[PDB]
Nucleic acid binder design. Sequence first.
DNA 1: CATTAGA
DNA 2: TCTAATG
Length: 327
Amino acid sequence: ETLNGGITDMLTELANFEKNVSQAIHKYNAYRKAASVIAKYPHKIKSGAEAKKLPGVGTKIAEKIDEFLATGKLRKLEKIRQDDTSSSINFLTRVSGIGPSAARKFVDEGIKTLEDLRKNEDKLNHHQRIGLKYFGDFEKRIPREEMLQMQDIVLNEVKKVDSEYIATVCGSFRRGAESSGDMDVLLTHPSFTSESTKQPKLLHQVVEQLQKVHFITDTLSKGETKFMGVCQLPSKNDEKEYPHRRIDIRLIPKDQYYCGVLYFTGSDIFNKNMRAHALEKGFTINEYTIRPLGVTGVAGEPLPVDSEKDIFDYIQWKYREPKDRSE
DNA sequence: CATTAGA
DNA sequence: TCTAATG
Ligand SMILES: [Co+2]
Ligand SMILES: [Co+2]
Ligand code: NA
Ligand code: NA
């Protein structure tokens, strides 16, 4: 956790560079299991060899580890940290809808910068087009102050469109979070569940709503169960307009909300931890359900949930306020 | 780990 | 269809 820090960090840098700049899935995949086990390691890694004893650590990594121990740096690392082509991918990559594939291809053609991107706005597709548009605002954290306002709005419409809707603003936001990255709205309705053959409009309707009034302003991608946009708070009696904000709306079969809802609320740790516990407690939990464990190894059989409660109850835990879903 | 675009 | 990107 800190005894093994710098080692794991360089390791992650290396890995990272492989998967992105180059296309070295293995090397890249290598760098991580390494960075994983070395991190589990309870003692101060004193040397290559020492590391080397590890599972996943070959001669190559060890070799780096030595140099890193030897001198606070790493050449290959300093070299990458330098290189423009590489630097460039790292950046272009920030643009929403720009992955590495595309990162590399752009570079290739010589689009290294943002400006470059603009001049060649033609080469960018709609998603990336928006990404480019809102580049600045896409990076900005969302203040809960704002979070509350947004949420208020969405809830309002959802309601008005259909009284039957059930919507949850999941994520950190849900968990107290002073800020948040984007807004995730968990949707479901009684007329949608496991079986009941869709009802795409169900999503469609509300989407429209939100756009209607100008809360949703763009569409990154909208499909039959997942919508992905950009929204924005009405810039008041002007002098101050609001930033463009990433926003996801997902339709859910009412017969799996709380699970999913549980799930999105997290934290990551609350998850796993709650997840590991359902196991002893004789269950299985995942993004949609909770199934009682059958001794023959596994077993199935979706347990019926009407609230986040139902789940804890099952695995007989203490009802944890989201607030304290932190770990 | 899955849903949407895209070409 | 495969392949990319976000989550
Ligand atoms: Co989020
Ligand atoms: Co999200
Ligand atoms: Na080894
Ligand atoms: Na990006």
